[PDB]
Structures are given as structure tokens and as C-alpha cells.
Amino acid sequence: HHWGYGKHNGPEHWHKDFPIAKGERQSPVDIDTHTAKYDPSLKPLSVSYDQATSLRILNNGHAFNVEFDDSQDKAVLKGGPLDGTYRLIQFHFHWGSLDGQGSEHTVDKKKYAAELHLVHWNTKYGDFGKAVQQPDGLAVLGIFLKVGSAKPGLQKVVDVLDSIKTKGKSADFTNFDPRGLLPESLDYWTYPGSLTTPPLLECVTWIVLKEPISVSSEQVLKFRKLNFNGEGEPEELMVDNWRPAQPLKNRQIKASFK
Ligand SMILES: COc1cc2c(cc1OS(N)(=O)=O)CC[C@@H]1[C@@H]2CC[C@]2(C)[C@@H](CC#N)CC[C@@H]12
Ligand SMILES: [Zn+2]
């Protein structure tokens, strides 16, 4: 009976195994655009994915991860609210069963069809495992997805999902360029938070872009064909793998734009 997104193991149950679920800096949160304040101390955000090296794609039973080789400083995120260099290690999405839900963060309570999470770890901590044990160990770039025009750069991902339909399945996924998943603008909101799934560690500096990318209905439909279950088990469609907004508590969401 391990955690999941169902009625008996979903988000409202996570606190029993992971008490931090009711912590002081949990994610995701609702972003109140009118309360978020422009922060002049924020430095220009730097997203350098030109030398990114993807290696494989995995269905871990909660979502699917496109993993990158982070043994060297290649695809990095810096600037903005960040101090130091954060290395890209993987990206994944959270989506819904319907176009009107799926995102973890919400903007003025509005839910998007999905949300992309590009995960990076602070290099001063040596490795990803050590980084997650630090308040400023990770930096996750969140990008909303809305249904409309197809996103050309996402099709490569969409077409390989049939090969990793069930939990535990992985497939080679080299030479995928994450720059093809970024919107035009880098305007963003930032706040201190946590991982959005167990163990819910409060080690993340969240940077959520204001501009969403558009993906086609067909593209998101394929996301919904994935399975939460492993091969040979009753089919449980991988949909609604998002955690709802959590209490903001003693935090302020800062905006990079005036
Ligand atoms: C930032 O990316 C994630 C990392 C992890 C999880 C979920 C994540 O998605 S999210 N929405 O971006 O928070 C869930 C499982 C976690 C893992 C991070 C590394 C952890 C803490 C392992 C420890 C190491 N290394 C144990 C469980 C792992
Ligand atoms: Zn995530």
C-alpha cells in the first residue's frame, strides 16, 4: 500500500508516512498574481541547455522521467533567485484526465492541462542525493501546458511513450533538446518550496514561468495512455498525477517582472 494518487493512497494520505506533508514550505501552491510582488533583487535568469545530453526515458509509476547525463556541467540553470550553478538531471510532467486540470501550481486558482518540471541540483553539494538534503539543494523550473497548437519539440517525447507504457519500463532517449519545450518569455514567479511527491523534501527553490507552452489535444491524449501499473497488471491509466495546492503559510511569491 505505497503512496499514489488514488482515493486510498492519494495526496490526503501522504502525511501519515511523510509528516512533512503538512510542513511550512510545501509545494505546489496557488500563485496569486495580484499579491505576488516584483523583486528588484532578482538577477537575470539563465537557462543554458545547449550542451544538454539526454540518455533515457523512464516510467516510474508516478510519471515519466527524461533523464540527462549530469556527470559534467552542461545543461545548467543559474541567475534569478539562485546562488550558484544548478545542473539539469531530469524533467517530467504532471497532467490530468481532462484539459481543465493537471497542473500542480495554479495561477489565481486556474488549473492548466499539465505542468512540466525541469529538475536541477546545486553543484556545490556534489551530487543529487546530497542536494535534496539541503534547503537550497534543488531548483525546479516549472512550465504550464495548455491545449491548443501542438508543440513541435514535444513530439519526440510523445512518440516514445508507447515503449514505456507501464511502471518500470525505460527506453533509450538520447539527443533530445529541452530548449524545444521552453516558451518565448522567461518571466517567472519564485518561492521556496518542496518536492511535490513523497518524500516531499523541502529542498526546492521553485521558478514557475508565467507564459505557458501550447500542446495539442492529441499530444496530451497520449500522455493519458500511460499506465500507473506495471506490465501484466490491471490497467490503471496514468492521469491526474498532480498534488493539489498547499498552504502558502509564511511565504511570499516574488515576481521577476514589473
Ligand atoms: C525534483 O524532482 C523530484 C524528485 C524526487 C521525487 C519527485 C520529484 O518531482 S517534483 N514534482 O519535481 O518534486 C520523488 C522521489 C524522490 C526524488 C528526489 C530524490 C529522492 C529524495 C531519493 C533520495 C536520493 N537521492 C529518495 C526519494 C527520491
Ligand atoms: Zn514534478
Side-chain angles (χ1 to χ4, degrees):
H1 184 78
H2 221 172
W3 77 269
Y5 293 88
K7 242 294 180 177
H8 304 84
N9 68 0
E12 307 308 325
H13 284 279
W14 300 349
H15 75 98
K16 289 171 291 181
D17 253 24
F18 306 97
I20 199 66
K22 297 174 180 291
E24 297 302 307
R25 57 176 281 185
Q26 286 293 289
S27 295
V29 302
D30 173 57
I31 298 174
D32 184 311
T33 66
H34 295 105
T35 297
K37 187 189 179 188
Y38 166 71
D39 185 350
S41 70
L42 291 173
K43 289 66 176 57
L45 183 67
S46 179
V47 186
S48 305
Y49 290 170
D50 52 296
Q51 296 302 310
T53 308
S54 62
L55 302 175
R56 143 242 218 196
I57 188 165
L58 167 78
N59 178 332
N60 59 33
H62 308 299
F64 66 81
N65 291 171
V66 168
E67 320 165 333
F68 295 75
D69 167 26
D70 58 354
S71 60
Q72 305 178 63
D73 264 313
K74 296 182 177 183
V76 301
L77 178 71
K78 62 180 61 175
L82 306 174
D83 280 349
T85 298
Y86 288 70
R87 196 174 294 174
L88 179 68
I89 178 172
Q90 60 105 312
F91 74 69
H92 57 277
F93 303 77
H94 295 273
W95 60 92
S97 52
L98 302 169
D99 296 355
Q101 63 193 62
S103 64
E104 298 209 296
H105 288 87
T106 52
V107 182
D108 289 339
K109 296 304 177 75
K110 172 204 173 67
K111 299 173 178 168
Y112 283 86
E115 189 173 321
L116 166 62
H117 288 166
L118 292 133
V119 185
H120 316 70
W121 54 278
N122 198 319
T123 60
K124 74 176 184 171
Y125 294 126
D127 65 64
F128 182 79
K130 183 65 172 181
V132 299
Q133 303 181 231
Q134 323 295 152
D136 61 350
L138 302 180
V140 183
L141 179 62
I143 301 178
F144 296 116
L145 280 64
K146 62 174 291 179
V147 175
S149 300
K151 190 66 178 176
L154 175 66
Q155 199 53 42
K156 291 291 188 176
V157 174
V158 169
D159 294 317
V160 72
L161 298 185
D162 290 314
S163 66
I164 60 165
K165 181 182 177 181
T166 46
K167 176 183 181 179
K169 300 189 90 67
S170 71
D172 302 304
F173 202 63
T174 54
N175 307 97
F176 178 77
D177 191 345
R179 292 180 296 188
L181 302 172
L182 305 176
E184 285 182 12
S185 178
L186 291 186
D187 283 352
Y188 67 80
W189 290 291
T190 187
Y191 75 92
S194 72
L195 305 177
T196 62
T197 83
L200 302 163
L201 303 176
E202 304 186 318
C203 61
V204 186
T205 291
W206 279 93
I207 300 177
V208 180
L209 301 189
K210 175 184 180 185
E211 181 180 0
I213 54 170
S214 293
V215 301
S216 69
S217 183
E218 292 73 26
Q219 291 182 312
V220 66
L221 280 172
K222 292 189 180 176
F223 273 33
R224 301 176 184 144
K225 290 189 178 300
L226 288 169
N227 285 186
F228 273 135
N229 58 288
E231 185 182 1
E233 310 184 314
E235 186 164 9
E236 202 173 305
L237 298 184
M238 184 176 279
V239 294
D240 291 323
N241 58 347
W242 50 279
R243 182 191 197 192
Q246 301 300 302
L248 184 62
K249 292 183 175 175
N250 193 208
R251 292 176 290 178
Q252 294 185 310
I253 296 180
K254 295 299 185 178
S256 74
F257 53 98
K258 300 173 181 179

